[model samples]
Target: GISLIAALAVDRVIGMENAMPWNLPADLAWFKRNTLNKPVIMGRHTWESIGRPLPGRKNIILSSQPGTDDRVTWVKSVDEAIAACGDVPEIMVIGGGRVYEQFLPKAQKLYLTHIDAEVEGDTHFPDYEPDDWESVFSEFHDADAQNSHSYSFEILERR
Candidate 1:
């Protein structure tokens, strides 16, 4: 099975330049623990953002360019990445925008963090059609002294 994780705001933007500036410690931990021992498929940009291999996971970096580092396994296409996962119990698609759009349909579950605010960003998430996904779990966080904007953690499944 494949899973997707992202945080998006109004206009469906997920990133400003190359990063997510929001304070979501819980979300970060959730991602780390869940994907720790699983295989992950990500684009070149996503790999660059992390700066190092996510320990214990088979990191498959997708790049059109030739010759990448040995520390990071690189592939040229989505199919190759998926095949690399083999019969692993699960695979995670940790990505930048374009990579998410490519696997949205085939991904079985989505772990989405929806921020209840509008933001100007250079990278945007693909438009999600409501009819195609159903919310399975949702947890709302209140705006507080620690954070300015409220956010919702939601788990959605393709319908």
Candidate 2:
């Protein structure tokens, strides 16, 4: 019932220290475009990194306690987050790091952009191989004035 979205470097690094290692406008735009009307679940760190609720969709954050705001519902568990999402086609799990690992088992679909560079990063996405998913869609995007790195958008349906 959950789909995951992220942009990772060739080395599978998603974050450096506490921030993204690189910037790719196309990837950001792609994320916004696809998750526009869906409910998105994220961990406390990811929510903190965002600092605000994503405009078009419901923001659901996983937290031990509530102290954030009225705009977003903070839940302590995955089942609670899933329940909050209601019955939707896809509940998007957007993350900083650990959240991905926690939801990986239940993640049924994946929308990812594979960046073309290897950068130094401390936070990483969970390890998985191509065999674990069936390719649903793919497109190669070139780096241009707005984007610093070339990347490929991939949709993978879990096998």
Candidate 3:
């Protein structure tokens, strides 16, 4: 099983036309802190948005018309991606909207960061029911010299 990780502003925007509107060092740091040396799975669009496989982790991309990559294992479905994780206890389901929506139902955990300000964006995180999960951990980070926005990192476990 794997946990889905995403960050969205108050307006539910994840990115603006495939590009991030603001740079939140804390949020990106949180992602690297948790996903380092782990298997990270994402959809084709997400991979394209990033431009390359994330370093120090196994990058798996879900795509029907998969491309060749020596650094990644392209999968056709979520199950195939999960199975590719092998004996790892968990994989990181990094996203680009639709992939998050697809795996939300089966996700055992969630690593979400809520940004304070809203920005115009074509990509957004999927809406989820609050009652279906319980917050197990959280930390608030205020915008300062290093980051662009105030945000809170929350870890949720399925009920």
Prediction 1 global C-alpha lDDT: 0.83
**How does each model score on TM-score?**
0.89, 0.94, 0.93
Per-candidate count of clashing residue pairs (backbone under 3 Å): 0, 0, 0
Per lDDT, the best of the predicted structures is 2
| Model 2: colliding residue pairs | none
The deviation in Å at residue 88 for candidate 2 is 1.0
Model 1 alpha-carbon drift over 4 Å, by segment: 143-148
Write model 1 residue lDDT over 1-159, tens digit each, in one string: 899888788888887674555666666676787689898888898888888898899999999997468987888999988988899877899888889989987898888877878778988777778899999998998867766678888888889
Best-to-worst ranking by TM-score: 2, 3, 1
Superposed Cα deviation of residue 74, candidate 2 (Å): 0.5
Q: What is the C-alpha RMSD of each candidate to the true structure, in Å?
A: 1.9, 1.3, 1.3
Cα distance off (Å), candidate 2, residue 59 = 0.2
Provide the lowest-lDDT 10-residue window in model 2.
Answer: 14-23
Residue lDDT tens for model 3, 20-123? 66778888889999899999998888888788889999999999985677689899987898888899978889997888888888899999999998788887
Report model 2's TM-score to 2 decimal places.
0.94
